[PDB]
Structure 1
Amino acid sequence: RTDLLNVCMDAKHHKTKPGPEDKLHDQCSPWKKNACCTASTSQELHKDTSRLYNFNWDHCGKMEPACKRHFIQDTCLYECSPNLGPWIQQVNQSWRKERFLDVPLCKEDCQRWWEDCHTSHTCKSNWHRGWDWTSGVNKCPAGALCRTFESYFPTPAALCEGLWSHSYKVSNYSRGSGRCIQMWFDSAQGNPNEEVARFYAAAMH
Structure 2
Amino acid sequence: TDLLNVCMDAKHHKTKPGPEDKLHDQCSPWKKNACCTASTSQELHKDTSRLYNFNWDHCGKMEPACKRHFIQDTCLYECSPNLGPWIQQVNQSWRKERFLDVPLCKEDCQRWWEDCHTSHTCKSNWHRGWDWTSGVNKCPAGALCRTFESYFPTPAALCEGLWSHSYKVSNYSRGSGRCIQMWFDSAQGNPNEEVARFYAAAM
TM bracket (short chain): over 0.9
How far apart are the structure 2 equivalents of 1:187 and 1:166? 26
Q: Deviations over 1:59-101 (max 9, x none)?
A: 0000000000000000000000000000000012111000110
TM (norm. structure 1) is: 0.98
Structure 1 residue ranges without an equivalent (≥5): none
Distance 2:97 2:128 in 1: 15
> What is the alpha-carbon distance in structure 2 between the residues aligned to residue 40 and residue 194 of structure 1?
24
Q: CA RMSD in A?
A: 0.5
Show CA shifts across 1:150-189 (max 9, x none). 0000000000000111110000000010000000001122
Alignment of 1:47-62 (within 5 A): 47-62=46-61
Distance in 2 of aligned mates of 1:179 and 1:189: 18
Question: How far apart in 1 are the matches of 2:201 and 2:139?
Answer: 42
Moved more, 55-64 or 86-95: 86-95
Where does residue 139 of structure 1 map in the other structure? 138
Measured after TM superposition, the shift of residue 35 of structure 1 is: 0.1
User: Alignment partner of 1:89: what SS?
Assistant: strand
Consecutive unaligned residues of structure 2, counting only runs of 5 or more, are none
TM-score, normalized by length of structure 2?
0.99
Task: State the identity as a percent.
Answer: 100
* Distance in 2 of aligned mates of 1:23 and 1:138: 29
Residue 180 of structure 2 corresponds to 181
Aligned length: 203
Give CA deviations for 1:16-47 in whole Å, capped at 9, x if unaligned: 00000000000000000000000000000000
Rounded Cα–Cα distance in structure 1 between residues aligned with 2:91 and 2:79: 22
Residue in structure 1 matched with residue 2 of structure 2 by the alignment: 3
Structure-2 separation of matches of 1:99 and 1:46? 21
SS in 1 for 2:129: coil
